[PDB]
Amino acid sequence: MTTITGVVLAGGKARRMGGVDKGLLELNGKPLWQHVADALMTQLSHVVVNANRHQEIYQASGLKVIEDSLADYPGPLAGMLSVMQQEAGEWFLFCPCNTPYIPPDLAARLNHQRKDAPVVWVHDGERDHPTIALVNRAIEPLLLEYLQAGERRVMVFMRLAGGHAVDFSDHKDAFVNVNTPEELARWQ
Ligand SMILES: [Li+]
């Protein structure tokens, strides 16, 4: 009953009892994933999080936590598919839990620039961010087929699905990633 569901992708796996839980690192007191969820809630009424470790902690801010299917598909596409299989509604705006500075016109600009494509993603002027992506329902069967086929490559999938990049080069450092504790330390 809203047009796009926002989704924070907080990672899959724990293919060696985790390591650092990136989404739970705190940037100025607030977990990175909650920075992203808050930014998505500025622009979208319905936001959920895909998390596969420390689920009770993710649950504490009162959003729906969605875990990956038993299929244990690889890579960020596995989380995308698991969320489309467990949420209704025609459009999803995915964003990793690592990009706390995403802007309040993310959804609006991706939608304005979608131009009939079933998926679009952010390009920051330097690189693609294919997991910051507005994705239509129609992608779900294609994603299932790709991951059942043993594939993992994100950009290859986005190309196969007929997507395109949307230029956010004018949004300075809104798309920076905080992948390690060492980077985070800098941004405080
Ligand atoms: Li642990």
PDB file of all heavy atoms in Angstrom, residues 1-37, unseen atoms left out:
ATOM      1  N   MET A   1       0.812  -1.267   0.000  1.00  0.00           N
ATOM      2  CA  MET A   1       0.000   0.000   0.000  1.00  0.00           C
ATOM      3  C   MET A   1       0.834   1.302   0.000  1.00  0.00           C
ATOM      4  O   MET A   1       0.298   2.401   0.191  1.00  0.00           O
ATOM      5  CB  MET A   1      -1.047  -0.003   1.128  1.00  0.00           C
ATOM      6  N   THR A   2       2.149   1.174  -0.204  1.00  0.00           N
ATOM      7  CA  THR A   2       2.960   2.300  -0.690  1.00  0.00           C
ATOM      8  C   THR A   2       3.678   1.801  -1.946  1.00  0.00           C
ATOM      9  O   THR A   2       3.641   0.603  -2.251  1.00  0.00           O
ATOM     10  CB  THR A   2       3.975   2.818   0.357  1.00  0.00           C
ATOM     11  OG1 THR A   2       4.809   1.735   0.812  1.00  0.00           O
ATOM     12  CG2 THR A   2       3.259   3.346   1.644  1.00  0.00           C
ATOM     13  N   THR A   3       4.310   2.720  -2.668  1.00  0.00           N
ATOM     14  CA  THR A   3       4.833   2.395  -3.982  1.00  0.00           C
ATOM     15  C   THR A   3       6.189   1.689  -3.956  1.00  0.00           C
ATOM     16  O   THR A   3       6.390   0.763  -4.747  1.00  0.00           O
ATOM     17  CB  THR A   3       4.902   3.635  -4.868  1.00  0.00           C
ATOM     18  OG1 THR A   3       5.734   4.615  -4.231  1.00  0.00           O
ATOM     19  CG2 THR A   3       3.522   4.313  -4.975  1.00  0.00           C
ATOM     20  N   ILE A   4       7.119   2.124  -3.084  1.00  0.00           N
ATOM     21  CA  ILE A   4       8.434   1.482  -2.980  1.00  0.00           C
ATOM     22  C   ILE A   4       8.709   1.048  -1.522  1.00  0.00           C
ATOM     23  O   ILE A   4       8.567   1.882  -0.665  1.00  0.00           O
ATOM     24  CB  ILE A   4       9.553   2.474  -3.464  1.00  0.00           C
ATOM     25  CG1 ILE A   4       9.248   3.002  -4.866  1.00  0.00           C
ATOM     26  CG2 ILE A   4      10.959   1.889  -3.375  1.00  0.00           C
ATOM     27  CD1 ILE A   4       9.781   4.393  -5.214  1.00  0.00           C
ATOM     28  N   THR A   5       9.146  -0.203  -1.259  1.00  0.00           N
ATOM     29  CA  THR A   5       9.683  -0.605   0.058  1.00  0.00           C
ATOM     30  C   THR A   5      11.181  -0.336   0.128  1.00  0.00           C
ATOM     31  O   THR A   5      11.919  -0.773  -0.756  1.00  0.00           O
ATOM     32  CB  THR A   5       9.463  -2.105   0.280  1.00  0.00           C
ATOM     33  OG1 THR A   5       8.047  -2.307   0.412  1.00  0.00           O
ATOM     34  CG2 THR A   5      10.137  -2.592   1.576  1.00  0.00           C
ATOM     35  N   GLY A   6      11.616   0.405   1.133  1.00  0.00           N
ATOM     36  CA  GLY A   6      13.057   0.567   1.345  1.00  0.00           C
ATOM     37  C   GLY A   6      13.666  -0.622   2.041  1.00  0.00           C
ATOM     38  O   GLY A   6      13.021  -1.210   2.947  1.00  0.00           O
ATOM     39  N   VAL A   7      14.863  -1.022   1.610  1.00  0.00           N
ATOM     40  CA  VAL A   7      15.488  -2.212   2.197  1.00  0.00           C
ATOM     41  C   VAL A   7      16.940  -1.939   2.521  1.00  0.00           C
ATOM     42  O   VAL A   7      17.708  -1.645   1.623  1.00  0.00           O
ATOM     43  CB  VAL A   7      15.481  -3.389   1.191  1.00  0.00           C
ATOM     44  CG1 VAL A   7      16.062  -4.658   1.861  1.00  0.00           C
ATOM     45  CG2 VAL A   7      14.066  -3.662   0.641  1.00  0.00           C
ATOM     46  N   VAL A   8      17.328  -2.160   3.771  1.00  0.00           N
ATOM     47  CA  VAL A   8      18.736  -2.003   4.145  1.00  0.00           C
ATOM     48  C   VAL A   8      19.345  -3.387   4.033  1.00  0.00           C
ATOM     49  O   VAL A   8      18.881  -4.336   4.590  1.00  0.00           O
ATOM     50  CB  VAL A   8      18.877  -1.468   5.586  1.00  0.00           C
ATOM     51  CG1 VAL A   8      20.408  -1.392   5.986  1.00  0.00           C
ATOM     52  CG2 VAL A   8      18.173  -0.119   5.712  1.00  0.00           C
ATOM     53  N   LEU A   9      20.405  -3.501   3.246  1.00  0.00           N
ATOM     54  CA  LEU A   9      21.043  -4.788   3.082  1.00  0.00           C
ATOM     55  C   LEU A   9      22.197  -4.871   4.071  1.00  0.00           C
ATOM     56  O   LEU A   9      23.236  -4.244   3.856  1.00  0.00           O
ATOM     57  CB  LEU A   9      21.622  -4.875   1.653  1.00  0.00           C
ATOM     58  CG  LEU A   9      20.556  -4.914   0.549  1.00  0.00           C
ATOM     59  CD1 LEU A   9      21.210  -4.848  -0.870  1.00  0.00           C
ATOM     60  CD2 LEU A   9      19.699  -6.180   0.663  1.00  0.00           C
ATOM     61  N   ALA A  10      22.005  -5.615   5.165  1.00  0.00           N
ATOM     62  CA  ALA A  10      23.062  -5.678   6.170  1.00  0.00           C
ATOM     63  C   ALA A  10      23.959  -6.925   6.038  1.00  0.00           C
ATOM     64  O   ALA A  10      24.729  -7.215   6.952  1.00  0.00           O
ATOM     65  CB  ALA A  10      22.509  -5.547   7.580  1.00  0.00           C
ATOM     66  N   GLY A  11      23.833  -7.680   4.951  1.00  0.00           N
ATOM     67  CA  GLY A  11      24.896  -8.623   4.571  1.00  0.00           C
ATOM     68  C   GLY A  11      24.345 -10.019   4.719  1.00  0.00           C
ATOM     69  O   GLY A  11      23.364 -10.246   5.446  1.00  0.00           O
ATOM     70  N   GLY A  12      25.004 -10.983   4.093  1.00  0.00           N
ATOM     71  CA  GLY A  12      24.534 -12.351   4.248  1.00  0.00           C
ATOM     72  C   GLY A  12      25.321 -13.171   5.251  1.00  0.00           C
ATOM     73  O   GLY A  12      25.753 -12.680   6.315  1.00  0.00           O
ATOM     74  N   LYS A  13      25.430 -14.455   4.892  1.00  0.00           N
ATOM     75  CA  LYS A  13      26.560 -15.335   5.211  1.00  0.00           C
ATOM     76  C   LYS A  13      26.877 -15.495   6.706  1.00  0.00           C
ATOM     77  O   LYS A  13      26.054 -16.029   7.450  1.00  0.00           O
ATOM     78  CB  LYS A  13      27.791 -14.925   4.384  1.00  0.00           C
ATOM     79  N   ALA A  14      28.033 -14.987   7.133  1.00  0.00           N
ATOM     80  CA  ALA A  14      28.721 -15.425   8.363  1.00  0.00           C
ATOM     81  C   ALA A  14      29.276 -16.807   8.063  1.00  0.00           C
ATOM     82  O   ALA A  14      28.949 -17.802   8.736  1.00  0.00           O
ATOM     83  CB  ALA A  14      27.809 -15.452   9.569  1.00  0.00           C
ATOM     84  N   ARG A  15      30.098 -16.815   7.007  1.00  0.00           N
ATOM     85  CA  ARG A  15      30.724 -17.985   6.408  1.00  0.00           C
ATOM     86  C   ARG A  15      31.978 -18.407   7.192  1.00  0.00           C
ATOM     87  O   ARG A  15      32.652 -19.397   6.863  1.00  0.00           O
ATOM     88  CB  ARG A  15      31.068 -17.674   4.960  1.00  0.00           C
ATOM     89  N   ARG A  16      32.266 -17.637   8.238  1.00  0.00           N
ATOM     90  CA  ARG A  16      33.219 -17.989   9.278  1.00  0.00           C
ATOM     91  C   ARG A  16      32.779 -17.163  10.489  1.00  0.00           C
ATOM     92  O   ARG A  16      33.210 -16.016  10.652  1.00  0.00           O
ATOM     93  CB  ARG A  16      34.657 -17.670   8.823  1.00  0.00           C
ATOM     94  CG  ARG A  16      35.634 -17.140   9.881  1.00  0.00           C
ATOM     95  CD  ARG A  16      36.931 -16.596   9.281  1.00  0.00           C
ATOM     96  NE  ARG A  16      38.010 -16.516  10.259  1.00  0.00           N
ATOM     97  CZ  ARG A  16      38.841 -17.509  10.562  1.00  0.00           C
ATOM     98  NH1 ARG A  16      38.736 -18.696   9.974  1.00  0.00           N
ATOM     99  NH2 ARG A  16      39.793 -17.317  11.467  1.00  0.00           N
ATOM    100  N   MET A  17      31.917 -17.759  11.319  1.00  0.00           N
ATOM    101  CA  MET A  17      31.182 -17.065  12.400  1.00  0.00           C
ATOM    102  C   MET A  17      31.383 -15.543  12.433  1.00  0.00           C
ATOM    103  O   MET A  17      31.830 -14.945  13.430  1.00  0.00           O
ATOM    104  CB  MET A  17      31.402 -17.701  13.770  1.00  0.00           C
ATOM    105  N   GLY A  18      31.029 -14.946  11.296  1.00  0.00           N
ATOM    106  CA  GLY A  18      31.048 -13.518  11.102  1.00  0.00           C
ATOM    107  C   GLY A  18      32.400 -12.875  10.929  1.00  0.00           C
ATOM    108  O   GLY A  18      32.956 -12.883   9.823  1.00  0.00           O
ATOM    109  N   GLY A  19      32.942 -12.326  12.020  1.00  0.00           N
ATOM    110  CA  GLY A  19      33.909 -11.239  11.891  1.00  0.00           C
ATOM    111  C   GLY A  19      33.111  -9.996  12.268  1.00  0.00           C
ATOM    112  O   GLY A  19      32.068 -10.107  12.873  1.00  0.00           O
ATOM    113  N   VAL A  20      33.573  -8.820  11.883  1.00  0.00           N
ATOM    114  CA  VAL A  20      32.881  -7.577  12.267  1.00  0.00           C
ATOM    115  C   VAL A  20      31.498  -7.524  11.662  1.00  0.00           C
ATOM    116  O   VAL A  20      31.300  -7.819  10.482  1.00  0.00           O
ATOM    117  CB  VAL A  20      33.674  -6.351  11.796  1.00  0.00           C
ATOM    118  CG1 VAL A  20      32.893  -5.070  12.067  1.00  0.00           C
ATOM    119  CG2 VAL A  20      35.010  -6.294  12.487  1.00  0.00           C
ATOM    120  N   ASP A  21      30.524  -7.136  12.466  1.00  0.00           N
ATOM    121  CA  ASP A  21      29.185  -6.926  11.940  1.00  0.00           C
ATOM    122  C   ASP A  21      29.111  -5.465  11.491  1.00  0.00           C
ATOM    123  O   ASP A  21      28.877  -4.564  12.259  1.00  0.00           O
ATOM    124  CB  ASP A  21      28.167  -7.263  13.018  1.00  0.00           C
ATOM    125  CG  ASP A  21      26.769  -7.324  12.480  1.00  0.00           C
ATOM    126  OD1 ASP A  21      26.395  -6.431  11.640  1.00  0.00           O
ATOM    127  OD2 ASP A  21      25.979  -8.190  12.783  1.00  0.00           O
ATOM    128  N   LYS A  22      29.354  -5.254  10.198  1.00  0.00           N
ATOM    129  CA  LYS A  22      29.512  -3.884   9.693  1.00  0.00           C
ATOM    130  C   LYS A  22      28.293  -2.997   9.991  1.00  0.00           C
ATOM    131  O   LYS A  22      28.425  -1.846  10.367  1.00  0.00           O
ATOM    132  CB  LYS A  22      29.762  -3.950   8.171  1.00  0.00           C
ATOM    133  CG  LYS A  22      31.233  -4.196   7.886  1.00  0.00           C
ATOM    134  CD  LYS A  22      31.651  -4.050   6.404  1.00  0.00           C
ATOM    135  CE  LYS A  22      30.562  -3.531   5.455  1.00  0.00           C
ATOM    136  NZ  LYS A  22      30.818  -3.778   3.956  1.00  0.00           N
ATOM    137  N   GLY A  23      27.092  -3.532   9.798  1.00  0.00           N
ATOM    138  CA  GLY A  23      25.883  -2.751  10.004  1.00  0.00           C
ATOM    139  C   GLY A  23      25.687  -2.291  11.416  1.00  0.00           C
ATOM    140  O   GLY A  23      24.996  -1.353  11.671  1.00  0.00           O
ATOM    141  N   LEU A  24      26.381  -2.947  12.340  1.00  0.00           N
ATOM    142  CA  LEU A  24      26.195  -2.573  13.738  1.00  0.00           C
ATOM    143  C   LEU A  24      27.319  -1.671  14.232  1.00  0.00           C
ATOM    144  O   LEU A  24      27.315  -1.244  15.402  1.00  0.00           O
ATOM    145  CB  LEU A  24      26.081  -3.829  14.601  1.00  0.00           C
ATOM    146  CG  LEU A  24      24.782  -4.588  14.402  1.00  0.00           C
ATOM    147  CD1 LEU A  24      24.841  -5.896  15.232  1.00  0.00           C
ATOM    148  CD2 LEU A  24      23.487  -3.780  14.802  1.00  0.00           C
ATOM    149  N   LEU A  25      28.293  -1.375  13.375  1.00  0.00           N
ATOM    150  CA  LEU A  25      29.302  -0.374  13.767  1.00  0.00           C
ATOM    151  C   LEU A  25      28.619   0.945  13.988  1.00  0.00           C
ATOM    152  O   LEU A  25      27.713   1.319  13.249  1.00  0.00           O
ATOM    153  CB  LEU A  25      30.322  -0.185  12.662  1.00  0.00           C
ATOM    154  CG  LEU A  25      31.227  -1.383  12.365  1.00  0.00           C
ATOM    155  CD1 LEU A  25      32.008  -1.172  11.053  1.00  0.00           C
ATOM    156  CD2 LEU A  25      32.143  -1.670  13.554  1.00  0.00           C
ATOM    157  N   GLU A  26      29.097   1.704  14.970  1.00  0.00           N
ATOM    158  CA  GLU A  26      28.388   2.908  15.336  1.00  0.00           C
ATOM    159  C   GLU A  26      29.080   4.149  14.807  1.00  0.00           C
ATOM    160  O   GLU A  26      30.246   4.342  15.048  1.00  0.00           O
ATOM    161  CB  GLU A  26      28.210   2.936  16.841  1.00  0.00           C
ATOM    162  CG  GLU A  26      27.246   1.867  17.303  1.00  0.00           C
ATOM    163  CD  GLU A  26      26.951   1.866  18.792  1.00  0.00           C
ATOM    164  OE1 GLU A  26      27.404   2.753  19.535  1.00  0.00           O
ATOM    165  OE2 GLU A  26      26.215   0.956  19.209  1.00  0.00           O
ATOM    166  N   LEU A  27      28.346   4.932  14.008  1.00  0.00           N
ATOM    167  CA  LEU A  27      28.865   6.184  13.502  1.00  0.00           C
ATOM    168  C   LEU A  27      28.181   7.258  14.317  1.00  0.00           C
ATOM    169  O   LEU A  27      26.961   7.399  14.319  1.00  0.00           O
ATOM    170  CB  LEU A  27      28.570   6.341  12.017  1.00  0.00           C
ATOM    171  CG  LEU A  27      28.718   7.779  11.476  1.00  0.00           C
ATOM    172  CD1 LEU A  27      30.176   8.234  11.481  1.00  0.00           C
ATOM    173  CD2 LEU A  27      28.131   7.856  10.069  1.00  0.00           C
ATOM    174  N   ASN A  28      28.982   8.017  15.062  1.00  0.00           N
ATOM    175  CA  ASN A  28      28.398   8.946  16.015  1.00  0.00           C
ATOM    176  C   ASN A  28      27.285   8.362  16.893  1.00  0.00           C
ATOM    177  O   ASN A  28      26.229   8.975  17.064  1.00  0.00           O
ATOM    178  CB  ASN A  28      27.940  10.221  15.300  1.00  0.00           C
ATOM    179  CG  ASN A  28      29.002  10.776  14.381  1.00  0.00           C
ATOM    180  OD1 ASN A  28      30.160  10.967  14.795  1.00  0.00           O
ATOM    181  ND2 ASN A  28      28.633  11.027  13.116  1.00  0.00           N
ATOM    182  N   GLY A  29      27.538   7.202  17.498  1.00  0.00           N
ATOM    183  CA  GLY A  29      26.578   6.601  18.418  1.00  0.00           C
ATOM    184  C   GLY A  29      25.464   5.746  17.824  1.00  0.00           C
ATOM    185  O   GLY A  29      24.724   5.046  18.553  1.00  0.00           O
ATOM    186  N   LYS A  30      25.326   5.830  16.497  1.00  0.00           N
ATOM    187  CA  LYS A  30      24.211   5.167  15.813  1.00  0.00           C
ATOM    188  C   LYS A  30      24.728   4.133  14.824  1.00  0.00           C
ATOM    189  O   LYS A  30      25.553   4.438  13.984  1.00  0.00           O
ATOM    190  CB  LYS A  30      23.362   6.188  15.082  1.00  0.00           C
ATOM    191  CG  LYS A  30      22.094   5.602  14.454  1.00  0.00           C
ATOM    192  CD  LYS A  30      21.473   6.579  13.452  1.00  0.00           C
ATOM    193  CE  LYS A  30      20.495   7.491  14.123  1.00  0.00           C
ATOM    194  NZ  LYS A  30      19.899   8.369  13.072  1.00  0.00           N
ATOM    195  N   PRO A  31      24.209   2.907  14.894  1.00  0.00           N
ATOM    196  CA  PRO A  31      24.679   1.872  13.964  1.00  0.00           C
ATOM    197  C   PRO A  31      24.545   2.347  12.526  1.00  0.00           C
ATOM    198  O   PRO A  31      23.535   3.048  12.210  1.00  0.00           O
ATOM    199  CB  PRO A  31      23.720   0.697  14.236  1.00  0.00           C
ATOM    200  CG  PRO A  31      23.013   0.966  15.527  1.00  0.00           C
ATOM    201  CD  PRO A  31      23.104   2.434  15.743  1.00  0.00           C
ATOM    202  N   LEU A  32      25.529   2.003  11.702  1.00  0.00           N
ATOM    203  CA  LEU A  32      25.570   2.368  10.286  1.00  0.00           C
ATOM    204  C   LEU A  32      24.246   1.957   9.675  1.00  0.00           C
ATOM    205  O   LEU A  32      23.674   2.733   8.939  1.00  0.00           O
ATOM    206  CB  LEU A  32      26.688   1.648   9.555  1.00  0.00           C
ATOM    207  CG  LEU A  32      28.067   2.217   9.832  1.00  0.00           C
ATOM    208  CD1 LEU A  32      29.082   1.404   9.077  1.00  0.00           C
ATOM    209  CD2 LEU A  32      28.155   3.716   9.516  1.00  0.00           C
ATOM    210  N   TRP A  33      23.737   0.755   9.960  1.00  0.00           N
ATOM    211  CA  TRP A  33      22.553   0.319   9.216  1.00  0.00           C
ATOM    212  C   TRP A  33      21.360   1.232   9.579  1.00  0.00           C
ATOM    213  O   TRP A  33      20.443   1.420   8.778  1.00  0.00           O
ATOM    214  CB  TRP A  33      22.186  -1.158   9.505  1.00  0.00           C
ATOM    215  CG  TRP A  33      21.380  -1.361  10.751  1.00  0.00           C
ATOM    216  CD1 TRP A  33      21.884  -1.604  12.010  1.00  0.00           C
ATOM    217  CD2 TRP A  33      19.978  -1.401  10.847  1.00  0.00           C
ATOM    218  NE1 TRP A  33      20.844  -1.800  12.884  1.00  0.00           N
ATOM    219  CE2 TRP A  33      19.656  -1.645  12.192  1.00  0.00           C
ATOM    220  CE3 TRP A  33      18.927  -1.210   9.913  1.00  0.00           C
ATOM    221  CZ2 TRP A  33      18.326  -1.745  12.632  1.00  0.00           C
ATOM    222  CZ3 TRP A  33      17.582  -1.315  10.338  1.00  0.00           C
ATOM    223  CH2 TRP A  33      17.304  -1.586  11.699  1.00  0.00           C
ATOM    224  N   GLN A  34      21.372   1.779  10.798  1.00  0.00           N
ATOM    225  CA  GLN A  34      20.264   2.628  11.197  1.00  0.00           C
ATOM    226  C   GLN A  34      20.404   4.021  10.578  1.00  0.00           C
ATOM    227  O   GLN A  34      19.377   4.668  10.247  1.00  0.00           O
ATOM    228  CB  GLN A  34      20.140   2.690  12.717  1.00  0.00           C
ATOM    229  CG  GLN A  34      18.918   3.498  13.118  1.00  0.00           C
ATOM    230  CD  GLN A  34      17.611   2.710  13.113  1.00  0.00           C
ATOM    231  OE1 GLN A  34      17.509   1.670  13.784  1.00  0.00           O
ATOM    232  NE2 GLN A  34      16.589   3.213  12.398  1.00  0.00           N
ATOM    233  N   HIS A  35      21.622   4.464  10.316  1.00  0.00           N
ATOM    234  CA  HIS A  35      21.802   5.674   9.482  1.00  0.00           C
ATOM    235  C   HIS A  35      21.139   5.485   8.152  1.00  0.00           C
ATOM    236  O   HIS A  35      20.439   6.387   7.663  1.00  0.00           O
ATOM    237  CB  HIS A  35      23.293   5.951   9.167  1.00  0.00           C
ATOM    238  CG  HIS A  35      24.031   6.605  10.284  1.00  0.00           C
ATOM    239  ND1 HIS A  35      24.178   7.982  10.359  1.00  0.00           N
ATOM    240  CD2 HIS A  35      24.674   6.090  11.364  1.00  0.00           C
ATOM    241  CE1 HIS A  35      24.867   8.280  11.454  1.00  0.00           C
ATOM    242  NE2 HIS A  35      25.185   7.152  12.068  1.00  0.00           N
ATOM    243  N   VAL A  36      21.362   4.327   7.526  1.00  0.00           N
ATOM    244  CA  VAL A  36      20.759   4.100   6.192  1.00  0.00           C
ATOM    245  C   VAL A  36      19.246   3.961   6.339  1.00  0.00           C
ATOM    246  O   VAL A  36      18.465   4.529   5.538  1.00  0.00           O
ATOM    247  CB  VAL A  36      21.369   2.816   5.544  1.00  0.00           C
ATOM    248  CG1 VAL A  36      20.759   2.544   4.216  1.00  0.00           C
ATOM    249  CG2 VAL A  36      22.864   3.003   5.430  1.00  0.00           C
ATOM    250  N   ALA A  37      18.790   3.194   7.328  1.00  0.00           N
ATOM    251  CA  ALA A  37      17.316   3.059   7.496  1.00  0.00           C
ATOM    252  C   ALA A  37      16.655   4.389   7.722  1.00  0.00           C
ATOM    253  O   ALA A  37      15.572   4.628   7.190  1.00  0.00           O
ATOM    254  CB  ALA A  37      16.933   2.099   8.652  1.00  0.00           C
TER     255      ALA A  37
END
